[PDB]
Amino acid sequence: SKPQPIAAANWKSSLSELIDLFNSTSINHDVQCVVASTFVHLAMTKERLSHPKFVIAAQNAGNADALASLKDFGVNWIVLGHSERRWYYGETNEIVADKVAAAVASGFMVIACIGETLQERESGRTAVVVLTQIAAIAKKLKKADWAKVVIAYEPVWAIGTGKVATPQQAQEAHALIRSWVSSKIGADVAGELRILYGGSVNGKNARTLYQQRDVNGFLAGLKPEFVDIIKATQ
């Protein structure tokens, strides 16, 4: 029916108490948990986090030598293209696609973030924006590569604003992405593809979002209610 869910916590900016919480939590269904951290916080997360359903992810690396060290250190997941990378730091669609392609070639699982802004949403350009972001990514990848790729739909207006996509809006967005992948890459690939929702997810609303046809999990904050979001992936 649905492929294995993912629950990914993005530590963008009390960690030890929190890791204690994750290590002690029984997770009684099949789900890949991910804790993405910054360089400086990577070795600590890697030393303290021992729950076998969890993996550590790096963020935003773009240098092959830097990819090589991360692998060497036992980091096999990476989060790329998250909003601030695009709207503050100036990562273009192509820059993000080169980073995704590089990370796949270096042997990483990639969570690639895409999503439109407030303006784009209101002017009816969600579809063209979101499908252009991801067509940039698919231009640098082969069919086989998609087994290492995870898509996070993250509406910029829903990131940290307190505004969550309704289940309807998240579903429409995910359906549009998957229907593009089924068309352009293959129906086999689309069926296996994890599309995660990101933006204002909490214990409350996660379960309801996860009931939607095309939602395969979540990208959220590194906070204690992450446990609830993990629990929601059924």
Ligand SMILES: *CC(=O)COP(=O)(O)O
């Ligand atoms: C993808 C993500 O980290 C969103 O953050 P939030 O504050 O909206 O949960």
